[model samples]
Target chain A: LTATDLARHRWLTDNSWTRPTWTVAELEAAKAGRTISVVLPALNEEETVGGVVETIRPLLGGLVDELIVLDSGSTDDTEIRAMAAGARVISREVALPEVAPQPGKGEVLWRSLAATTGDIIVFIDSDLIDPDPMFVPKLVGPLLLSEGVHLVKGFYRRPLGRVTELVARPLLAALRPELTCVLQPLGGEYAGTRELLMSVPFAPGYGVEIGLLVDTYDRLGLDAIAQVNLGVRAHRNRPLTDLAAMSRQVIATLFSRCGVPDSGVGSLVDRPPMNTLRGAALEHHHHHH
Target chain B: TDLARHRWLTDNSWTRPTWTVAELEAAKAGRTISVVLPALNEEETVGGVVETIRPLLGGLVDELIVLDSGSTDDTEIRAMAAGARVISREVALPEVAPQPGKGEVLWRSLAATTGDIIVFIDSDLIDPDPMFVPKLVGPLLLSEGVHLVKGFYRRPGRVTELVARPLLAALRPELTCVLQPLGGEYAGTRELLMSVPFAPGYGVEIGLLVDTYDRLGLDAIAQVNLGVRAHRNRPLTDLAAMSRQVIATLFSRCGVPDSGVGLTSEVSLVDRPPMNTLRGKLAAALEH
Candidate 1:
């Protein structure tokens, strides 16, 4: 709600905010009958998906209306495990039947709207080693209670790998300093209202997190954006070599939106088909337009 | 030039390799290492730089010298107080005329110290780790034919991101993999330092990299990740001037003549101390 400083907005393990203990009636009262969808775009995340789902299983019926897992062509038993963990699993091709499926993290995320019916959508990475239940409530809390916020990005105290410090953070400071206060700029855990999410394009790859941040700030002024501190996140850190490839995608996404000419990597095409249509056409004519 | 070598360097290069006390002790049996700091009005940070490496003075580092360049502050006094042998630029090589710039101080420091391996780190570092000396010197000591090793850290600043990276990408693509190439923290063998010409002023870092690749090839050089570096951030205007000198040196060394790129500088690289013409043969003899 206030300006983006590191202190007032960011939360950590030492914060004094008490975790809310809620019944269905009390949470529905607090939510004012608003619905929330928790989507996890998983691929080969069989090892950690069950734990990630179990941690937040309590929020499935009440505060969280629906839990969806959009599988991005996983060869592993991701779908069956996530289903056994009580999440509605939908493959990318089956989520949106008519359109040809594109293989990317953002593609599955974009198609999630067709499979769910919640006004507020929250995205969490499934490959988390130490997934927390508080991550969902704390992230979506600001969006529900706060008046002017449409998007909420979650920041944690997870020590960053080399790519973030070396490539992403510095690149953001140079090009997009407004989002510099967002500690985990490329962090996958975030929540946004349906209107805000659909308004901007989804970057097809590793650029999704940053693309959303920049696009939200560009469309809605800085005042509309909020970041919640989600304590500590213990996700898998990619190797240094993998980070180099990841950095290229992030840089491509950033430069493409900022109107900087693409030198080597081609332009980023993230505008989803649903977002391109007029207001009501998305429901009946999902692919006609 | 080999594909496997490029791939190996790109992936295997990392920052977590710590030159442990035991490793350094084993490697120090036959090797002589010297740590040198080039200073000019760095009173605030010189003491920390000297104090961090004070323990390694006799065991890992045979000589620790701070070659000060006319500091108006307490840089000289603080360096000496922290247990480093201090020498002014003029005093290091009193026989030769004193020249202004970091390259001059470093070139003269070669004659002032007696170590086969010379490690150069900037004096104005806020958090200087003693491990930086051993981590950088480790590769050269443990592996044979590693002529030079540069310290690459998390350099988060304006000039490095905006100017240096783009320029390096455009001109010297092979050398672009080395993060913080223009950083003043680096290490080199006496033979390589003497053989390659040192570019004047701030151009020294880039010059050494290009000349090393030219002489010994990429395998001879390596980059050690020295962890986080928190130092003073220079003003944007000062960086513009510094980049100009660096660009000039790059053009002189790598630029093509009469190629319509509109580069005017015709300066050639200047040798440091002017080693003998048959110095290559003499150095080869000394190695065996």
Candidate 2:
């Protein structure tokens, strides 16, 4: 990853078409012994959930086992919409009662293990604008190749606005050389074994990606993780100041894994434990499926 | 106390007790040392930064980190490919209630890292230099007394170079070891950094310097050069504002006459964070 090679990559990635060959057969073959499940973690996404579920469900149809949508409480027709769209939508609170319900992007992910029926679990955030059916298969490809690589995922990003292209990319290019292989490492699309995922706890909020990357790295080691290409993903955007909190969460985890003390900043976050079966606090009544 | 509770609460205490870059390397003897980058929407230049510095520091700094600030762009992907321990900020502080600030993210970074020493660099620097980390960490790592080091870049512009540098030189000559006081790149004993106070937003760098200096004293400070940096230029007004606050912080600590006050160019410093609603500001003030 020399400075010279980067200049070349600048031209190569910029000029190159991103469509690379993926082995669908290899992926299916890898699932022969492995029971696969995909968890579509959603909040208010009713429009895209159906199509995303339909797309990825077939990849594991009978060969892989379950396809569940562990949903955070949604206001829109999201629950009915996803169910009609062919997904087994389960309320996150009902599915993981032992773990106290806290609302967030990662609440479902952190608790999915309690209900998921698979040796390998794949998670996709359900806000995709153009989610191809192959998205799931592509993400699961790296895991099929070897058991050593426990976490396999996608990393394709939408085109950047002028500000990010000019200011942000160069910053990333200068800081990370190995990770340059990923197109979008922080993306919601990812897959891995239940055993591996369970061994490490999930970060139950927006900071889930950073928490996983760090925890997985610590527990699974570097060679166990893999990133694959997902052609394109489009989602939402926020102002720069909005990004500061997200960025800070990511940085804090890195420092912690490196052995720095919590220093009081960790006090700002609250990750309360919960119950999956009762879906209630000790005093509250339980909700049945 | 519950084991988990105690672990979560006390886990981030800085390790190594004392950090010296050379001593860490010497102790590592043969083990690998890694650096991690926590990145965000740095798509514009992260690739170049990663590629440029990976060669030299790659050998010395075992791992490079790119902890993403949840970049909508390709920052996360680019960093992963570039060989960084690329991660999202949210994931770093899983146990705590998440907050929205860079310093908060930087603070939580303690959870995800496993380096002999950790150095933080800004993702927005136009010029990507790997040596910045080595230079900052090298002195601190090599020397026993040095706890923290800050980096200052060479300002080639006649105006900034001439005016800011010399002015800074006179005000805090000892602190001038760092050519640029506000430079983001720096390295230090992990123990000292973890134990210090971290202010939330733009105040992190200066706050760190003041806090570290307060704890370790002027003798513990050192400055290293990053050669010449060709990065984004701050607006003159913004620079003036930044200078006023920086000078105020230094002056408050260094004890001096608040010279150069004039009717035309009064340097009254004000600490302001972006306030959307009157209630937001009032609430924040109430908490304080």
Candidate 3:
């Protein structure tokens, strides 16, 4: 907010981390009976999902307590590949069955919370091409090592998307200058504690990443966030028309947060915080069956 | 910086405007004003737009010129019938070849008019208020340090909402507070207007606004709310073309010059050099 405020931040070095920043041994020691769940929100990645699953398969017993592939809906053999590569797969319907499921990466990520019971929730894309195994542990590092850090976003070098360049970066630079330090605000790979995740609402579309980042900063302030340089992440870019759809959701999320009303087919409709939704009849009906 | 921006909005932004026509005339201080309306095939509304501003021609406004963009309809006759001197876009500056755009006509108007202050309004405005000309020029006439006064009302339009707002948010975050970053009505001093290049498309407004802020500090800029403006909305495809030019201008200011985006329009990013720099080029072209 001020030069002095930023000076205190730099003095602490809110420190950036690299891939080998946190060793597995230190992470295991730091676990101290805490639980971590690595979730890959898979839709239709039958061909490439196996490697993404296999990449994180090694972290299952020690560092990661559970590895679950939160399936949005795969008309392919995605479920088989995820299970074959050692991940427990759950369908979209299974996570909060009483609520009607929506079609988006954010919707899947939001619903994934209802399905997992870990202390820390790490998210990675299931369609990744040659993803690093350290993605989960690297993402989970700050949450385990630091006392105050609640959200750790992973940044890497890859082909950039226009939505990130033209929309998200500009939006952040305009509305939230403090987040200028975040390398990839809309990046899919990151991890947060369950308590923090459940406390903030999630945009039910592509804007989920930005909503979480801003909402996290709003609730906990910038001091609770951390960034990690997870080595090169690879994913195919969507078509321009589809990118426009994503941009609409993104604009809605940013605008809605800034006192602008959003109304339409894909206008941002953020789900309530999972903490607030726990005791409802829907949850009881969902868990009872 | 945010503090300065907040304070600026408090001190700079206005609603309905308090400066009257007679008040602007008293504060003129020997400054001549030229009113420019860039029109294209708007025969339906051009006469009414011209009629609305005809009241201020001798007092606060010295010239009311409608720069016609080769309109096929009788916009020239309509504008002229309402006591406006209509200047064809091509005939304004015969030395250099003319390009087709609102900025091309606007740039030429600088050569054609003899005013120390210039006020620009879109000619397609429907049922427009007469006070728009007075309100836009009011700040420049009243405020000591102000050079540019942009008009703002409201927009839920696609281009301004999706393209311009986000781009301004990123490029000039302070400008996001501006209610109508892409509003058509505005006025500026000749000194500031000639100091910047004009993007020759729908993006000219944004280009001038950003350049003025860069050349002259934020204090030089002011905004007056036009209180609810009415204009004919275009088709979605036409807005797509506008968005491309706006994007091109924003990135061009960022030093890319050409964004190389595959927009489906023949319109490319070309800025008419600042008029001050063009004096030599203009002389050379006329000599040649």
- Model 3, B200-255: lDDT tens per residue? 77778888888988888788899998876544568655766666677667767766
lDDT (tens digit, per residue) of candidate 1 on A159-233: 564445445554454455456556677888888888777667788877788788887767664556777777765
Model 2, global lDDT: 0.56
RMSD of each: 12.4, 22.8, 15.8
> How many Å off is the CA of A28 in candidate 3?
40
On the 0 to 100 scale, the lDDT of residue A249 in model 3 is 75
Q: Quote the positional error of residue A113 for candidate 1 in Å.
A: 2.9
DockQ of 1: 0.05
Off-target runs (Cα >4 Å) in candidate 2 are A1-20, A23-26, A157-183, A234-236, A264-289, B1-288
lDDT of 3 by residue, A1-289 (tens): 5543373367237645755377887999998888999889998999888999898888878888888999988999999988988899998888888788877888898888999989899999887887887888789888998877889998887656556655665545445646656768888899998878888788877889988988887666667788888886565668756776677777678656654444443333578888776521111112233
Candidate 1 Cα lDDT to native: 0.71
> Can you give the DockQ of every candidate in the order shown?
0.05, 0.02, 0.04
Please, what are the lDDT tens digits per residue for candidate 2 over residues A136-224?
76766667655476777576756662112211122123223233233444567888776566655455465676566655655544456
Note the chain A TM-score of all models in turn.
0.84, 0.75, 0.89
Ordered by lDDT, highest first, the candidates read 3, 1, 2
What DockQ class does candidate 2 belong to?
incorrect
